[PDB]
Swiss-Prot record, chain A:
Protein known as: Chaperone protein PapD
Task performed by this protein: Binds and caps interactive surfaces on P pilus subunits to prevent them from participating in non-productive interactions. Facilitates the import of P pilus subunits into the periplasm, probably also facilitates their folding. Chaperone-subunit complexes are then targeted to the PapC outer membrane usher where the chaperone must uncap from the subunits. Coexpression of this chaperone with individual, otherwise toxic, P pilus subunits (tested with PapA, PapE and PapG) suppresses their growth inhibitory phenotype.
Organism: Escherichia coli
Cysteines joined through disulfide linkages: 207-212
Upper taxonomic lineage: Bacteria, Pseudomonadati, Pseudomonadota, Gammaproteobacteria, Enterobacterales
Self-association and partners: Interacts with substrates PapG and PapK.
Main location: periplasm
């Protein structure tokens, strides 16, 4: 009933706060919307350094509203040359119900919330994911993410179509890290990743020996 | 329309209320009811759907996910025909797909009891 406007949130550290739009799409009933923040380990955090307000609000039938995200002074203690990971959670609370013998289901949504410090602020539609490097390893690839951003890889195949529709175990690489991924060997690897907007561009890689980099 | 600023998925707006009717002319244990919702995505997507138990079950159902409905009764809650508490749906392109939540009543006889049934679960959508 209560929908969220995005599949991930990027908090620009240049700002003190931002808002996420939510909508009660149900035109007959009011719903409460609970919002809260979890840290990179999925611990619920209530006193910062990122907070969501209000924790609960009521949305009348059809109403739109917002959740405000803001930072506490202790946000300064986070690294300032790379993103930090949080999760934004939205849970709806439906009313009643006053009917006998019912199972009631409430929807909850959990999305990634990337704290992006001011120093690594990005231009709109900037692309850093083409900086990924693929290492050929026994049974797959070790993907290096040298960027200061979390990178979510959702596809890896030998063709563009296979990068998009092939079966792949999603992996998110932390800033300046590397992770080994299971895969068939590909002569010309294609990789799909999720950008700030929530879309999935595809990148074409070229290999030399054990190392593949984005075809330039 | 300013490039909707963000790609999103939105579930169907209807109240998720799985109704088992009057349990009087069938007053049943293996009783089944369901609710289908849809989810519309602007972008490709994976969504991992995970049922969260709110009200605790009276019986143990092993690896089947359940919720207590009160008195002697439990519901085994399925999602897209899976009793195990989790499913993932995938969108290669923008579009909408259905997700069906099913409820199958379970009650013993020893533990049973006469009154009205009421239960709740949370369907958690985890987006990568």
């Amino acid at each position: 009933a209560v929908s969220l406007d995005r599949t991930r949130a990027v908090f620009d550290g240049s700002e003190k706060s931002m808002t996420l739009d939510i909508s009660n799409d149900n035109k007959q009933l009011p719903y409460l919307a609970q919002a809260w923040i979890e840290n990179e380990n999925q611990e619920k955090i209530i006193t910062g350094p990122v907070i969501a307000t209000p924790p609960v609000q009521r949305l009348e039938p059809g109403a739109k509203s917002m959740v405000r995200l803001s930072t506490t002074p202790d946000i300064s203690k986070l690294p300032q040359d790379r993103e930090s990971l949080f999760y934004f959670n939205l849970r709806e609370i439906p009313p009643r119900s006053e009917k006998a013998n019912v199972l009631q289901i409430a929807l909850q949504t959990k999305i990634k919330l990337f704290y992006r410090p001011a120093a690594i602020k990005t231009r709109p539609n900037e692309v850093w994911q083409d900086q990924l490097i693929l290492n050929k390893v026994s049974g797959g690839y070790r993907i290096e993410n040298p960027t200061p951003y979390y990178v979510t890889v959702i596809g890896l195949g030998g063709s563009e179509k296979q990068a998009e529709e092939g079966e792949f175990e999603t992996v998110m690489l932390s800033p300046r890290s590397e992770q080994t991924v299971k895969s068939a060997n590909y002569n010309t690897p294609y990789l799909s990743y999720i950008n700030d907007y929530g879309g999935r561009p595809v990148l074409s890689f070229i290999c030399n020996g054990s190392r593949c980099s984005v075809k330039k | 329309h300013h490039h909707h600023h963000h790609g999103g998925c939105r579930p169907s707006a209807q109240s998720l209320e799985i109704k088992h009717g009057d349990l009087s002319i069938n007053s049943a244990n293996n009783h089944y009811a369901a609710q289908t919702l849809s989810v519309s995505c602007d972008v490709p997507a994976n969504i991992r759907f995970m049922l969260l138990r709110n009200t605790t079950p009276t019986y143990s159902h092993g690896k089947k996910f359940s919720v207590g409905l009160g008195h002697g009764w439990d519901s085994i809650v399925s999602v897209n025909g899976v009793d195990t508490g989790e499913t993932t749906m995938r969108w290669y392109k923008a579009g909408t797909q259905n997700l069906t939540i099913g409820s199958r009543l379970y009650g013993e006889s020893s533990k049973i009891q006469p009154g009205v049934l009421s239960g709740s679960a949370t369907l958690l959508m985890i987006l990568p």
